């Protein structure tokens, strides 16, 4: 009956009695009739001291009860922020669900535990997880009156939809892009360096996605942190058909980055003759110097692109 005495001590919060019982051979993973273990109970009542002890003595951080509740489900239910951080620390399942489909984030967002919510998200909690009733954490927050947590969850949702749109744009998944847009993703979002979905599509040469993004209000002249526009990226990677659509949709043909390089500079240095001819036809300044002083002609000569040098020398 050591199991009963360990369950009791864990619930009451008797730190020493927990150690005395474990030392005398108590099974750290015993369970009452419903399925709660010594860890479940210590997490339900908030005894951080016994939590750390039990984990250190071989407790299963992810034990389930009859209804599929885990220790993390409980600590998130009772608002004990310190215990949640430690359960995750030992490999607790941030997205473990119960028979109803409820995850810890459903619980921390239903009982107004702002800190626990942002801690769960940082560890990978899914804001779009739906329970058996079709409720996400954001739905339960609005049903109870936690409006700040609801906004935070909305923020994380848009943050996640934007990341997906950037990746879909890079990878060339026209279907995912168009659906992400129809779900409210910002076509103008930007990663840490300032690349928008239209930057990535032009860089990778996915013409179909360039067109879609532009038809949905994408900033054709958006600048990354280095001052590059999508046209800069299409010109130097050599995607002729994208350059034409970009220019047809308002692309500044004389945009300059932090180094003072225009698209013509990049097309001439990388040796894309057709794009050089198209840029000139659309108004590119043939004589433009970058901050170091080089013209596109000098860059073509530097790289042995004689055809390009000829065309630039004639347009000058």
Numbering used by the authors: 13 to 328
Paste lines from the article.
In the context of DARPin-β-lactamase fusions, we observed that the paratope of this DARPin has a high propensity to form major crystal contacts, leading to crystal formation under a wide variety of conditions. Indeed, constructs D12_Hxx_D12 with H02, H09, H11, H13 and H15 yielded diffraction-quality crystals in space groups P212121, P6122, P212121, C2 and P1, respectively, at resolutions ranging from 1.8 Å to 3.5 Å. Only three of the D12 constructs did not rely on paratope-paratope interactions, but instead relied on paratope-capping repeat or paratope-connector module interactions as dominant crystal contacts: D12_H11_D12, D12_H13_D12 and D12_H12_D12_H12_D12 (P21). The propensity of DARPin D12 to engage in crystal contacts is so large that, where the crystal geometry does not allow for its preferred interaction, alternative interaction geometries are observed. These are found as paratope-paratope interactions, interactions with the DARPin N- and C-caps, with connector modules or with the target protein of a second DARPin in the construct.
In this paper, we present a strategy to fuse specific, high-affinity protein binders to obtain multivalent or multispecific scaffolds of predetermined geometry. DARPins are used as building blocks to confer the desired specificity to the construct. A series of rigid connector modules replacing the DARPin capping repeats allow to combine the individual DARPin domains in such a way that their distance and angle can be altered to test different geometries, bringing the binding partners of the DARPins into a defined spatial arrangement. The two helices are not just joined end-to-end, but instead the two domains are made to overlap in such a way that the joining helix is stabilized by contacts with the domain cores along its entire length.
